[PDB]
Ligand binder design. Structure first.
Ligand code: SF4
Ligand code: SF4
Ligand code: SF4
Lengths: 628, 628
């Protein structure tokens, strides 16, 4: 089968074959037929009595592990641990952001750039703002956010966009969230040998844990990032590997933590570093981003996006990356080995993400700007080691428009508001187009790449099908970057791919049919948006014609995201089967019984066209239930 | 191979074969040859690009997972997740204890029974005590303990017995603990795909996480349990399955959390329940304990111990267990199936541990005594369903002495203190016998059973070898219960098994050669004891001739325990190989490089006699280093 639908990706794969280096596709081929027990989730290693593998087919073979655990128990515990790991990644990201907010000052490297957003957040956290210094408010808000992570007494703080009905449903179901780290610890405790051996209770614990990701960790990370670095607005950028410059220093920022990439962007305008780039024979400094850190700097500053997850290696294959600076998460360790075949300096910066044989330059949060400057200086000095005979940058780049935060979307919707009617600054125009049926619904396309799927194929096919069916699409993460590379993040795309209702809406509001809402933590924005719509219509989020899709997901973070999206009341389609087919009870819970608990459920569909059809049918069913 | 060295265990295995019921041994046989990849730890399932298996033999076969992770990376991440799971179990136990302390009242079900212990703990937590109400002090202490779990700013609180040198070494190494749930979340975050791919850093993160178990979670759980339920003192009890009564109601308490078992013990003396037991035709109520909850109620009240981990099923096989009340952890789910073959009521009580097809009666912490009375009444009423023709109780039980908390040990040591010299109430006599060489050292024997080892064989052989070599032995958990069943927890055992120096010490202090220090969380007591000795000698804990042994461990909790014992500076022998042989770098870190970091290291030895020899040699070389 084809490795990708992206032509620049194919050219660089040919180059990697010529250079004798191996990619993620080569390692996937080397893995051959993957273990059936692990693929079905019926393998357990939770204690040293094991490893235990039970039959994925009920009634045949070994039925129980040594402790007596059934296939359903093993599957449910494995699924719960995936959710706990994803929640941990997102919560650690949000915790770093909250600590950075706590360390803001007027004359420091980290300031408050959006005071209005900070005051609204302070209102949401019961922090007084009138007649107060802005940094005192910021510190109080950071304290409340940090308490959300580890409070042992009392209730956590949730955003006002979350409907009261959803909160009450969670409380009745027993999944109402506690402090984030406490829920992660609870999930890890209940999967220990000889604890929870009941699939339904295990799934409910995993949902409870995922809620602390969706509504607390990711939400606080996003809002505090907006406070410190600015709320995203409509902005132009370029996407795909063609953004690399042969005649300039190329600095590629890969990872998820935004403070480092923000400081690197600021350092790139330093006169001394620009002069140094000139002195090593380069035209200038060309910052490019990848994955979620690329999404953040692109949403807030228009930094060009070099590529998504499965392109990271190919960025090095060009031979033009002088410095690849990585913080945490979705950083393929093979990069270190790959960096030996080129001049590239592979720089790790976080104590959480040491990588063997990489150059470690710890990013100092006490002096973020100076630390970013020294890291960037190492990348710039590496330009002298460039071998221009090994350089091949495909001439394939695509224009994209992004920056669609909830605030930006509301500002855009204000155009189609009659002044004599109003109100202004609400999601009411979006609610109106959804209720009238001009738009059939809204769908979130999120997730990673996965060698099991032709890279970017499922993302593009799902998005085109949805917008052709007058479903407005919001995108995050690597799916958003696939849309950017393909050319869907363009106003012109409205008349090229969208159906009649969505084309009319795009023309009236002057937006692309696909709205890039940011990184994987920025999925919280989507929740926020949906919540507002629900609160405007006086219904729960499970009554709306909305859906989420993860066509090509790979990470534990994706599992946690899908779990909290379903738990919030939004049906989720998975384009990659999770390791649960071995447990019939777990499959039945996730795809059938979940609708009785939270009004939504998982859909597993590896065919994107069938997924689009199912999404449209489900949205029409919910519309008929709602009367619209 | 023999299944056990215990004769009562063998008789009940014959009965289980005659009854056509499966045991843990039968399921272990059914599992046959366990997966080599999982056994070596070279299998990874951390993302849905996998499952990935790399060769356990370097230089052959597949070398890297799909993301590029090496065998060392996969092994280190698997080990770190085991540590995180064990830390989560212990920390959740301690968190429940702290919450119970927070709800103590003068006229409530949960009171303060050891005010002196509470005042000393309050001193350790910087809580004022002079001229204050005892329950105000208790609530402040509980607040400080709870803050240890989830504080995001500042430093955690550690017991005064921990040497300053050990803390400084931890700070220099980068493993100084943070809040417990924060460290669990950090480990889970760093094992996520594309985060940490460096074995040394991964092992250091796991050590940092395990420290929050050893010195914060388990320590606080133990000390708060002492405050609420009484400090253990020397007390007699009986052990092994013979403690069951044919003519009495048999109520078996299995699990770890002590509040439920304490309330059940209190409810058993209720006049209405005793009258009800008489009216259903029984002579009375016979409470028996298993595993750690049995250890707690036995340490504090002399409740008879029915058996350790791999005996739980056999307790039901007798046909005499009218009620089996379980809370969390090390509860084989197969019990639910097994109790169908008998009249036994298998009662789950904790929302953390639901077991399918068991009778769920949620233990209400708000009204603990009434809830325990209701559960106990269900067990008593089940006596009418006893089938006395199916009853077979082995006439095999053994006298044991336990209750050796640090306070009790100090009280015993006061006997050999010359009044004209002093001081009293210190560990000085123990330090003196260790320094003079009358005792060669002290060894902690802890851990579970494991079907991979003849049950209780390794525990008994290791303990007998150590005490024969004049090494005083402290025991916890299932190892302590194996010692109890065998008969080592007896004063007479001093003249039957101990060497000359240990026999003299036992005669002078009037103690058994093997000291039962309580449950698995009570391993913190051992740390406390060692710390005091170190603080009395002005040395670090790695300079002492001490060791820990886990001859037959199975649980993730055992992994976390061994990790924090080694990190505290105490060499640890493992009688069951952990899944790390596939990663040569991880093996080298755990067994060789750890000594450079923390002055102690792991020893993997499956032969108990060889383990005793190695322990004696290591203790002698540490003595020669210390000059004693
Ligand atoms: S999933 Fe289990 S059975 Fe399959 S290779 Fe991995 S450890 Fe072995
Ligand atoms: S927890 Fe149970 S099923 Fe899992 S490895 Fe241990 S004995 Fe086997
Ligand atoms: S994390 Fe890497 S090694 Fe583990 S399953 Fe995913 S791709 Fe394979």
């Amino acid at each position: 089968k084809a490795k990708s639908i992206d032509q620049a990706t194919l050219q660089l794969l040919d180059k990697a074959k010529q250079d004798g280096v191996e990619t993620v596709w080569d390692r996937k081929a080397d893995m051959k037929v993957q273990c059936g027990f692990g693929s079905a989730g019926v393998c357990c290693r939770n204690c040293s009595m094991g490893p235990c593998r039970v039959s994925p087919v009920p009634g045949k073979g070994v039925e129980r592990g040594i402790c007596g655990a059934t296939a359903d128990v093993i599957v449910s515990r494995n699924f719960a641990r995936m959710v706990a790991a994803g929640t941990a990644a997102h919560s650690d990201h949000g915790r770093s952001i909250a600590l950075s907010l706590y360390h803001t000052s007027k004359d420091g490297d980290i300031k408050v750039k959006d005071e209005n957003k900070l005051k609204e957040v302070a209102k949401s956290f019961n922090v007084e703002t009138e007649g107060r210094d802005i940094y005192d408010i910021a510190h109080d808000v950071a304290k409340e956010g940090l308490s959300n992570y580890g409070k042992q007494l009392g209730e956590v703080t949730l955003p006002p966009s979350l409907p009261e009905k959803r909160k009450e449903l969670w409380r009745k179901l027993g999944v109402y969230p506690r402090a984030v780290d406490r829920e992660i610890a609870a999930v890890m405790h209940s999967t220990h040998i000889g604890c929870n051996a009941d699939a339904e209770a295990m799934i409910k614990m995993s949902m409870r844990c995922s809620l602390t990701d969706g509504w607390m960790g990711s939400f606080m990370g996003t809002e505090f990032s907006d406070i410190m670095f600015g709320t995203p607005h409509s902005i132009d950028t370029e996407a795909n590997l063609g953004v690399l410059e042969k005649n300039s220093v190329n600095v590629v920022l890969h990872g998820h933590e935004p403070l480092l990439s923000e400081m690197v962007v600021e350092a790139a305008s330093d006169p001394e570093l620009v002069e140094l780039a000139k002195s090593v024979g380069a035209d200038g400094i060309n910052l490019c981003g990848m994955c979620c850190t690329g999404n953040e700097v692109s949403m807030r500053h228009g930094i060009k996006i070099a590529g998504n997850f499965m392109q990271q290696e190919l960025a090095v294959v060009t031979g033009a990356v002088d410095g690849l600076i990585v913080d945490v998460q979705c950083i393929m360790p093979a990069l270190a080995k790959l960096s030996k075949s080129y001049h590239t300096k592979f720089i790790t910066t976080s104590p959480k993400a040491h990588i063997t044989d990489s150059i470690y330059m710890e990013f100092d949060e006490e002096n973020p700007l100076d630390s970013a400057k020294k890291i960037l200086k190492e990348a710039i000095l590496n330009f002298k080691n460039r071998d221009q005979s090994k350089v091949m940058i495909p001439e394939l780049k695509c224009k994209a428009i992004l920056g669609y935060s909830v605030e930006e979307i509301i500002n855009k919707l204000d155009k189609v508001v009659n002044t004599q009617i109003g109100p202004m600054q609400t999601v009411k125009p979006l609610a109106d187009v959804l209720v009238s049926g001009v738009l059939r619904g809204a769908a979130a396309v999120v997730g990673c790449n996965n060698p099991k799927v032709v890279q970017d194929s499922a993302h593009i096919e799902t998005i085109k099908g949805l917008i052709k069916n007058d479903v407005i699409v919001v995108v995050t993460g690597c799916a958003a970057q696939a849309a950017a590379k393909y050319g869907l993040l363009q106003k012109e795309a409205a008349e090229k791919y969208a159906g009649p209702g969505l084309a009319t809406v795009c023309k009236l509001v002057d937006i692309p049919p696909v709205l890039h809402m940011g990184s994987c933590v920025d999925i919280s924005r989507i929740l926020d948006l949906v919540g507002r719509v629900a609160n405007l219509l006086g219904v729960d989020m499970s009554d709306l014609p909305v859906a989420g899709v993860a066509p090509e997901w790979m990470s534990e973070k994706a599992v946690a995201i899908g779990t909290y999206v379903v738990t919030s009341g939004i049906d989720t389609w998975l384009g990659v089967a999770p390791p649960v087919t071995g447990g019939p009870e777990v499959v039945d819970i996730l795809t059938n019984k979940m609708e009785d608990w939270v009004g939504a459920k998982f859909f597993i569909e590896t065919d994107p066209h069938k997924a689009v059809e199912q999404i449209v049918n489900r949205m029409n069913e919910k519309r008929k239930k709602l009367g619209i």
